[PDB]
Amino acid sequence: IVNEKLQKIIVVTDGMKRLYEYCNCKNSLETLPSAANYGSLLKRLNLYNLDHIEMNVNFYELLFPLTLYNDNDKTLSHQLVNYIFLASNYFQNCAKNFNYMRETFNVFGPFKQIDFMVMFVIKFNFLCDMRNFAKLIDELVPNKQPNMRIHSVLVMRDKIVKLAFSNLQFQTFSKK
């Protein structure tokens, strides 16, 4: 299985949006998630305990399926790399200011699971942007037999994102 991941990502994102009755993909983001946009999302999330929330995104594998698209034609060859760097910077800022993000979201109706809420909104906004990009590139055909040489950039940015999440996790844990 080297291609089912993309369609399963689409399906699981749709199912999660259904489960939490929220599909606000309209508010595409490039600076920082905010309660100004995701306050109702916080309220919806409070309905169900957010135990299944991870302190990382698995950047590389997460974005790997997007490479499958055929770009023989280039459009994807550069738009995808743009997206990779954008995601890298977005996660950098999110992890760097997670405390600021969580104080803000908590100020919006403090939640016992505030950290879960902030992480989930980060994940959800990223998934919305990713699905918008996937629609932008829905014309291209995903398939295996890859040879990119930009997945090396993907690996590098994934390492950077993992280190950022690592510092974030260390802060959260060490602060009791």
DSSP class of residue 44?
Answer: H
- 61 is an interface residue for a copy of itself by CB under 8 A: yes
- 170 is an interface residue for other proteins by CB under 8 A: no
Q: Which of 126, 129, 131 lies closest to 10, judged by CA?
A: 131
The single residue listed with the structure tokens 């929330």 is 53
Interacting residues with other proteins between 8 and 67 (CB under 8 A): 30-31
- CB within 8 Å of 156: residues ≥ 6 apart: none
Q: How far apart, in whole angstroms, are the C-alpha atoms of residue 104 and residue 114? A: 10
Stretch that binds a copy of itself, among 73-81, 86-94, 112-120, 132-140 (CB under 8 A): 112-120
Residue type (1 letter), 64: F
DSSP class of residue 21?
Answer: T
Please give the residue ranges that form the binding site for other proteins (CB under 8 A): 30-31, 74, 77-79, 81-83, 85-86, 89, 92-93, 96, 133, 136, 149-150, 152-153, 156, 159-160, 163
Please give the residue ranges that form the binding site for a copy of itself (CB under 8 A): 1-2, 4-5, 8, 49-52, 54-56, 58, 60-61, 64, 67, 112-113, 115-116, 144-146, 148, 151, 154-155, 158-159, 162-163, 166-167, 169-170, 173-174, 176
